[PDB]
Amino acid sequence: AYKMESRIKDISLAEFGLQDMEIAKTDMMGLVELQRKYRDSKPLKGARITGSLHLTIETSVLVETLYELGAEIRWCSCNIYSTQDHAAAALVKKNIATVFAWKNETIEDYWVCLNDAMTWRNPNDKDKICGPNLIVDDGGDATLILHEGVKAEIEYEKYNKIPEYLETELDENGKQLSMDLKCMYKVLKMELLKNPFRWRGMLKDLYGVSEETTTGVLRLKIMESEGKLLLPAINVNDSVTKSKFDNTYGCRQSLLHGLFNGCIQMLAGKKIVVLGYGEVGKGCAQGLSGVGARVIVTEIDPICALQASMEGYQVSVLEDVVSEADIFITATGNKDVITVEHMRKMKENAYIANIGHFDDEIDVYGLENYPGIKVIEVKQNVHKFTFPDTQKSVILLCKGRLVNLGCATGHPPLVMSMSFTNQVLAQMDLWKSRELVDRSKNTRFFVKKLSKELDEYVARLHLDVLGIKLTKLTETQAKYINVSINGPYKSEDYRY
């Protein structure tokens, strides 16, 4: 059932995956505790969960936790390069989940895999096609294919034909659509022809989505302000134990791993430009400085720019340092941060990489299609592009995809356990409140966050890993600072 239906690279790699999961668990005490505490009561019993999140060894422990808490699971990765095949094999081999993921997927297969993960069959009702009850999303692709599907079906009924926007290679104003959109549209057209009520049919049983990253939250917020969000949502990224640990300390280590694997050069003494000084950019700069690099920051936000200056970093606009810098790292969550025109001005063998969720930060398409460009594969997922006029080259790590997961194996278990403990709590919250979702009356959905009580709980579960000894307030002390001995200890607007 699980092996037949799953689509993975190689099932024989399962044991390596299982051994790694067990080693990782020494530090993932949040997930370990959740399994110990809830594997019998099963708070997610009966829930069909579709996950779209980089299928790493850390993610396998997340999936395992969901499974032990009673859920059935279908999973895919949210990036073509991030899957670790031995982690994927472990899940399939142990019948923990039906998996559709492998390292180095074509963009076409990426969308087929996501759609496959969203496609369920109900054994209690003639194996009728249905959707998930809950979604674990990272970047919003699962949430996007649902909403774009609903949109495609409404447009389909309106004129009783395939929408024209799904059959063209151009967008609203003559520009070539990204390959990801063309590949998603190809799947949406394929599903309209099979059943044009598919996506709307899924809304009946869908009780929520828990989003992992900043870019996904951005997408959720935009839908919410337009009144187009079709299901409840929990913003996992903005938990303190997520955004202030994963985004920061996780990248501090994983960026370096990615650069070490993709870039052969010494980082020490190099001028490295970190574009964006947010939670991710802060961790990146700290890591880079930690190994002797001279970090130059770019920012649009005056507060973040000043914070960078307070840490001793030069803050410049890209145009003033593009011709002189050695390495460029985008961490903005924005688009067109590094253009082809910027690339043409870079010094010989300047390295370029992105750590934001999507490749849009760098004009990778513009570079690959530059007339007369020459490309060489330096190593797996590292390419050198040479311009014909100047004969100068630039080296791009993993086609602009998040470098820590494209050129390395992402953040280590400890911080992923903090992030994933929030995910499990979010999934439990959405499932346990499923009765309160009413579509025949309200229809308007919102984005929320987990309570500070839970947020603090995530931190408590990981203290023993590092031998942290916490102090306990006396009754008189608690009253003095106006808090309960058991927390929460900070006001809702506290920034840590």
Ligand X SMILES: Nc1ncnc2c1ncn2CC[C@H](O)C(=O)O
State which residue, 189 or 271, has the beta carbon closest to ligand NAD: 271
| Minimum CB distance to ligand NAD, residue 127 (Å) | 40
Q: How many CB atoms lie within 10 A of CB 425?
A: 23
Burial 351-388, CB ≥16 within 10 A → b, else e: bbbbbbbbbbbbbbbebeebeeeeeeeeeebbbebbbe
According to the annotation, is 357 in a ligand binding site? Answer: yes
According to the annotation, is 215 in a ligand binding site? Answer: yes
Give residues in contact with a copy of itself (CB under 8 A). Answer: 16, 19-20, 23-24, 26-27, 38, 40-43, 45-47, 57, 70, 204-205, 207, 249, 252-253, 256-257, 260-261, 264-271, 286-287, 289-292, 324, 348-349, 376, 378-379, 384, 395, 408-409, 411-415, 432, 434-435, 437, 465-467
According to the annotation, is 456 in a ligand binding site? Answer: no
Rounded Cα distance between 421 and 35, Å, is 11
DSSP state letter for 384: E
The contacts found for 117-122 with CB under 8 angstroms, 24 or more apart, are 117/50, 117/51, 117/52, 117/74, 117/75, 117/76, 117/142, 118/50, 118/74, 118/142, 118/145, 118/146, 118/202, 119/74, 120/48, 120/50, 120/74
Binding segment for ligand NAD among 34-42, 288-296, 332-340, 437-445 (CB under 6 A)?
332-340
Query: Where do we find the tokens 């603090």?
Result: 456
Report yes or no: 246 and 415 within 8 Å, Cβ to Cβ.
yes
Query: Where do we find the tokens 């990204």?
Result: 178
Rounded Cα distance between 316 and 194, Å, is 53
Report yes or no: 405 and 80 within 8 Å, Cβ to Cβ.
no
Rounded Cα distance between 260 and 275, Å, is 19
Report yes or no: 288 and 259 within 8 Å, Cβ to Cβ.
no
Residue nearest to ligand NAD (CB): 278
According to the annotation, is 411 in a ligand binding site? Answer: yes
Rounded Cα distance between 389 and 371, Å, is 10
| Minimum CB distance to ligand X, residue 84 (Å) | 8
Rounded Cα distance between 81 and 401, Å, is 8
State which residue, 465 or 473, has the beta carbon closest to a copy of itself: 465
According to the annotation, is 404 in a ligand binding site? Answer: yes
Report yes or no: 198 and 434 within 8 Å, Cβ to Cβ.
no
Residue 299's binding partner, choosing from ligand NAD, ligand X, a copy of itself, none, with beta-carbon cut-off 5 to 8 A by kind? Answer: ligand NAD
State which residue, 87 or 430, has the beta carbon closest to ligand X: 87
Residue 212's binding partner, choosing from a copy of itself, ligand X, ligand NAD, none, with beta-carbon cut-off 5 to 8 A by kind? Answer: ligand X
According to the annotation, is 443 in a ligand binding site? Answer: no
| Minimum CB distance to ligand X, residue 217 (Å) | 9
State which residue, 181 or 459, has the beta carbon closest to a copy of itself: 459
Rounded Cα distance between 427 and 423, Å, is 6
Is position 275 an interface residue for ligand NAD (rule: CB under 6 A)? yes
**x/- contact string, 35-54, with ligand NAD (CB under 6 A)?**
--------------------
State which residue, 262 or 333, has the beta carbon closest to ligand NAD: 333
Strands 374-379 and 294-298: unpaired
Rounded Cα distance between 247 and 411, Å, is 9
According to the annotation, is 299 in a ligand binding site? Answer: yes
The CA-based dihedral angle spanning residues 209, 215, 221, 222, taken in that order and rounded to the nearest 10 degrees? -120
Q: Which residues contact 291 (CB under 8 A, 6 or more apart)?
A: 256, 267, 268
According to the annotation, is 386 in a ligand binding site? Answer: no
State which residue, 210 or 253, has the beta carbon closest to a copy of itself: 253
State which residue, 285 or 454, has the beta carbon closest to ligand NAD: 285
Give residues 290-319 in contact with ligand NAD (rule: CB under 6 A).
298-301, 304
Q: Which residues are catalytic?
A: 54, 77, 82, 138, 212, 237, 242, 246-247, 251, 357, 411, 419, 423
Return binding residues for S-adenosyl-L-homocysteine.
54, 56, 58, 79, 212, 242, 246, 358, 409, 411
Return binding residues for adenosine.
54, 56, 58, 138, 212-213, 242, 246, 357, 409, 411
Query: Where along the sequence are the contacts to ligand NAD (CB under 6 A)?
Result: 213-215, 246-247, 251, 275-281, 298-301, 304, 331-334, 337, 355-357, 402, 404, 410
Return binding residues for NAD(+).
213-215, 247, 278-283, 299, 334, 355-357, 404, 411, 490, 494
